[PDB]
């Protein structure tokens, strides 16, 4: 069957592991355990297609982020994740996109901007900024919440659709 190699990048603590496990195991991880790397293979049906998702959960902290270039080099689509209560993580979004564009050596790379932790009552990132930023990249933007599962399927499935457009 068809496979989609997905990579989740973003600053440390934004929710990359909680989003993946929410999609893969249908539950919210409350504890924080920093990631070096974690890989998953999960079968799912998107828009009628039975396909296999190959999710690579990368590191956000820099000291953990050794070998981040190689993980990005093999991925086909990227979830660029930031937390809406962490303005530093949203500023880093442009750094992750440029690092992806250079390791893949391509201008168009299937990519989706993700704003996590929308369940939180107070935020520090303007949704108007994220829509504007993703618009200038040519990629979609999706507000998610790994605690309430809001938008979690939307994020990964939209990325898969962006990979289809690339292959087709």
């Amino acid at each position: 069957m068809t496979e989609y190699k997905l990579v989740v990048v973003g600053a440390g603590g934004v929710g990359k592991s909680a989003l993946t496990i929410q999609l893969i195991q249908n539950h919210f991880v409350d504890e924080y355990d920093p990631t070096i790397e974690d890989s998953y293979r999960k079968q799912v049906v998107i828009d009628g297609e039975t396909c296999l998702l190959d999710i690579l959960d990368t590191a956000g902290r820099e000291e953990y982020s050794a070998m981040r270039d190689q993980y990005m080099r093999t991925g086909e689509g990227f979830l660029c994740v930031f937390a809406i209560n962490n303005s530093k993580s949203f500023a880093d979004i442009n750094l992750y996109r440029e690092q992806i564009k250079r390791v893949k050596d391509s201008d168009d790379v299937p990519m989706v901007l993700v704003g996590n932790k929308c369940d939180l009552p107070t935020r520090t990132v303007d949704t108007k900024q994220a829509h504007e930023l993703a618009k200038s990249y040519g990629i979609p933007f999706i507000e998610t919440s790994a605690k309430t599962r809001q938008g979690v399927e939307d994020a990964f499935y939209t990325l898969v659709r962006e990979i289809r457009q690339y292959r087709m």
Partner: protein
């Protein structure tokens, strides 16, 4: 298979690529022909079946990244000294009983992952790897760290979680650049006082140890965002500790010997959004202890010695989730009506005979658990909990439900098991979103209301050990769907 292994080695040197990726190829023995690939700067061999590395790998002098995670290596070739430019060494998920002697000689290493191994010794030669910024020996069998740990003055993260450390060498206070120190799931009996030197320390894992106290010098780690001391032998906190951690988001003193609240007054909870104190011996919550905790939204007092609540407990207006399970509470005060921002209220395993009429003022309440109490009656005011979705009343003395129970238009879970209950109200039919109705172990329930069929989404239901003698024995012998269709007929 092996066909791609030897042929892609020639493919690498023909392309003259500075990167070889032989991962997930089930490789058992790396062929010696890799000595020709001296232009390599990255060699990825993770997720294979290697048990040893060939000596010829020591020819790759230009190597900077060596990924050997998820293998079965027990040592490394002593010829790896020639890799004088190696930066990161990933050896996690292997079978090492000690750090290979050659790794203590790779003084250019900045990143070293030894996670998930059987390592028992950290030699004093670890001081040679002083350019390290990340040292992860998580999930090993290490019982002691040498004092030479203090010469890794570039460390940002020291991950020694899931080991058997009984003491931390006091020289740890010399790794000033540390922001992440993970010591959880060990056997620490105390902590060195020099821990206050790590002024950049923002994340400190101490849970699941044997600590009996916290050094007062921890007040110098004012960058800490979370203090989680779960599962220890601590009873008090040093003077002006919690007030000093001006960036603390959550405090977790669960599973300890706290018989009283920590001293400091209300000024020590002015920054936490959460507070977990479950599984202790606290006999009273101090009056006014939360008069300055204006962001505290979650409180957990489960499994303690609380027999009553403070008089100003009704002023906890910023509380969203409150857990008072497993205590000796005999009464809920009427002042509970002031907690208008409460969304989850857990009161299971207490001595509650009845509930106050002010309970109906919890407009935001979404989940109410009262399992294993002594409830003789429900207050009529439960009808005004418009936002309630889960009500757990299992194991009580309830004989009747208030007829207003049908006003719970958002109720989806109703647990009425292990009660007396002579009957359900006819107003049960207005519970539109009801989905789970547990009625098991009700020896007095000889009938079911005919209006129950109006609950369209009612899928899960248990009726084991219920007489239901007014209903036919053949209908009740079937199951939930049998009585589901039976009630639709007569109506």
């Amino acid at each position: 298979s092996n066909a791609e292994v030897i042929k892609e080695l020639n493919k690498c040197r023909e392309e003259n690529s500075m990167r070889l990726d032989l991962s997930k190829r089930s490789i058992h023995i790396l062929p010696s022909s890799i000595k020709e690939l001296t232009q390599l700067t990255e060699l990825y061999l993770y997720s294979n079946k290697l048990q040893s590395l060939p000596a010829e790998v020591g020819c790759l002098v230009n190597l900077m990244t060596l990924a050997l995670s998820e293998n079965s290596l027990t040592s490394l070739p002593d010829s790896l000294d020639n890799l004088k430019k190696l930066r990161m060494l990933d050896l996690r998920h292997n079978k090492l009983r000690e750090i290979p002697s050659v790794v203590y000689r790779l003084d250019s290493l900045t990143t070293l992952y030894l996670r998930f191994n059987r390592i028992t010794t950290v030699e004093k030669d670890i001081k040679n790897l002083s350019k390290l910024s990340m040292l992860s020996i998580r999930e090993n069998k290490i019982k002691q760290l040498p004092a030479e740990i203090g010469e890794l003055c570039n460390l940002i993260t020291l991950d020694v979680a899931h080991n058997q450390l009984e003491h931390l060498p006091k020289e740890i206070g010399n790794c000033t650049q540390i922001t992440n120190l993970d010591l959880q799931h060990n056997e620490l009996l105390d902590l060195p006082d020099t821990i206050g030197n790590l002024s950049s320390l923002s994340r400190l894992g101490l849970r699941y140890n044997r600590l009996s106290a916290i050094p007062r010098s921890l007040a110098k780690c004012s960058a800490l965002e979370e203090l989680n001391l779960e599962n220890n032998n601590i009873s008090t906190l040093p003077e002006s500790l919690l007030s000093s951690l001006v960036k603390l988001n959550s405090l977790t003193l669960a599973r300890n010997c706290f018989q009283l609240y920590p001293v400091g007054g209300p000024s020590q909870f002015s920054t936490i959004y959460s507070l977990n104190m479950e599984h202790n011996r606290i006999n009273k919550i101090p009056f006014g202890i939360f008069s300055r905790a204006k962001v505290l939204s979650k409180l957990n007092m489960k499994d303690n010695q609380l027999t009553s609540l403070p008089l100003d407990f009704g002023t906890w207006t910023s509380m969203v989730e409150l857990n008072l399970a497993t205590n000796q509470l005999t009464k809920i005060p009427e002042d509970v009506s002031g907690l208008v921002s409460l969304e989850v209220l857990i009161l299971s395993n207490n001595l509650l005979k009845k509930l106050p009429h002010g309970l109906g003022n919890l407009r935001k309440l979404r989940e109410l658990d009262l399992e294993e109490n002594k409830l003789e009656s429900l207050p009529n005011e439960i009808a005004y909990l418009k936002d309630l979705q889960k009500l757990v009343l299992t194991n009580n003395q309830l004989t009747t439900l208030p007829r207003g129970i049908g006003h719970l238009t958002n109720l989806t879970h109703l647990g009425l098991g292990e009660n007396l209950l002579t009957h359900l109200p006819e107003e049960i039919g207005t519970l539109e979103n009801l989905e789970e109705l547990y009625l098991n172990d009700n020896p007095n329930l000889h009938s079911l209301p005919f209006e129950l069929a109006l609950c369209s989404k009612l899928s899960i239901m248990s009726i084991e050990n219920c007489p239901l003698s007014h209903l036919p024995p053949q209908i009740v012998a079937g199951g939930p769907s049998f009585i589901i269709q039976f009630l639709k007929m007569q109506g």
